């Protein structure tokens, strides 16, 4: 049946296989007519040099412009022949190439895919075309303020590290960019073991690995500095002013990463548009709906390899900024001391739900593996996560937050019309309570 305890038990397990040249193989059988076929690569900007900045990004567009065996636009005209959707995306710490398809024609898929991974048509026809679009887009990118401030955010904490740099990289490089340097980075980091392969669907493990089928896969990092600081772009014309505030935290692999998953879930989030009103349990969603001290906000977590990011992102009236803050320091600080096991539970349940929730669907299932592999390896400790949940304690959360919050140096990002936002020296004194 479906019973939460038993519900953990029966799942198609993590599968693993390993080829010779460093390629990884892995899978899970969902008993489904379709398969998400995907690839994840750990080559980052944090690898990329100061010219390489944004190049792999530029590269990202290029694969589908045609390849070695398949010149321009002969690539997709086979793809859509099957009717199988196709997509690719990249990230500072990862890049994921993947396919969503019926399990039938997969024998082509990976072979199609394998061609793309390395064999590529590097043709300055596409280059200039793509060189333009990016440049076109580079300027357009000022339209979504969200992404904008984060760029500021990293650079202010991680200054002096390749991690602190634009994903697309600065503009002039893209013009200056030449496809030989690509071929470098093409050759550099697209080797295995850097490469990793997974999939999920009706696919069985060995019927994956057999048709993982002989093609090829392949043949530097530093701990980053953390900057107590501030950045402000003051532009007063705009109606609203985003805010972001955070402190650094543990990397991907680390015990406490889960212990802090809940504190966010507990403190929760608010938005203009909820039907929750003023009776919600989250003090923030109660007040921020009550006096509409903000339009909305949400809290984030991002844990890098060695690093982690805890903080929120809010939007409030140009006269309402201060009061959002003096509230927001309330919640974190009060947790570190006076918190209680009751509210723990309501946080505990949610994260269980959110965990179980995201686990439906081919691609997301497929998608965990790749990062997880590049992160914890094969580990998909599904039922364990539950056991992991049972670990967390009142002291734990307090003792955890005591570390990473009380009397620390926070980072401050801002975007105009900021001006109200108090000076740092307030925020700093505002981190540690005086016992009030």
């Amino acid at each position: 049946t479906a019973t939460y305890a038993q519900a953990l038990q029966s799942v198609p397990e993590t599968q693993v296989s390993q080829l010779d040249n460093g390629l990884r193989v892995a899978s899970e059988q969902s008993s489904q007519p379709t398969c998400t076929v995907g690839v994840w690569i750990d080559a980052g900007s944090r690898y990329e040099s100061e010219k390489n900045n944004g190049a792999g990004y530029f590269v990202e567009h290029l694969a589908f412009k045609g390849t070695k065996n398949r010149p321009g636009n002969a690539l997709e005209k086979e793809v859509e022949s099957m009717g199988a959707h196709l997509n690719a995306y990249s990230t500072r710490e990862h890049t994921a190439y993947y396919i969503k398809a019926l399990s039938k024609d997969l024998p082509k898929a990976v072979e199609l895919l394998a061609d793309i991974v390395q064999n590529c048509s590097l043709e300055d026809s596409q280059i200039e075309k793509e060189r333009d679009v990016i440049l076109q887009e580079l300027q357009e990118n000022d339209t979504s303020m969200r992404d904008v401030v984060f760029n500021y955010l990293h650079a202010t904490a991680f200054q002096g590290t390749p991690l602190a740099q634009s994903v697309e990289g600065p503009s002039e490089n893209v013009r200056k960019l030449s496809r030989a340097d690509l071929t470098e980075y093409l050759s550099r980091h697209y080797k295995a073991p850097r490469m990793v392969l997974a999939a999920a669907g009706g696919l069985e493990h060995r019927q994956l690995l057999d048709l993982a089928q002989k093609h090829f896969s392949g043949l530097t990092l530093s701990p980053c500095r953390f900057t107590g600081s501030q950045i402000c772009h003051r532009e007063d014309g705009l109606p609203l002013a985003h805010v972001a505030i955070a402190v650094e935290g543990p990397g991907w692999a680390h015990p406490d990463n889960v212990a802090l998953q809940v504190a966010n879930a507990i403190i929760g989030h608010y938005d203009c548009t909820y039907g929750g009103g003023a009776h919600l349990s989250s003090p923030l969603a109660s007040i921020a709906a009550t006096n509409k001290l903000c339009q909305s906000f949400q809290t984030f977590n991002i844990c890098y390899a060695d690093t982690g990011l805890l903080g929120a992102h809010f939007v409030c009236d140009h006269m309402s900024i201060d009061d959002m803050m003096f509230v927001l320091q309330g919640q974190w600080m009060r947790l570190c001391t006076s918190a209680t096991e009751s509210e723990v539970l309501r946080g505990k349940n949610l994260l269980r739900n959110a965990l179980v929730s995201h686990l439906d669907g081919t691609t997301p299932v497929c998608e965990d593996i790749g990062r997880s592999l590049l992160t914890y390896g094969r580990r998909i400790p599904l039922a364990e996560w539950e056991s992991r949940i049972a670990e967390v304690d009142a002291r734990v959360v307090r003792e955890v937050c005591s570390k990473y919050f009380y009397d620390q140096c926070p980072a401050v990002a801002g975007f105009g019309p900021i001006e109200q936002l108090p000076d740092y020296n307030r925020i700093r004194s505002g981190m540690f309570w005086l016992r009030f």
Binding site: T337, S338, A339, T340, E341
Partner: protein, 39 residues
Amino acid sequence: RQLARNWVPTASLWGAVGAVGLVWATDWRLILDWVPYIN
């Protein structure tokens, strides 16, 4: 409920503070010399 959290140890110190404070003030009870206090 009533769960009195770290406030309990917190407060524990506080009373000690100004108690010492009044002791530091002048008070009445001497304070067995304990490092030199003039005769």
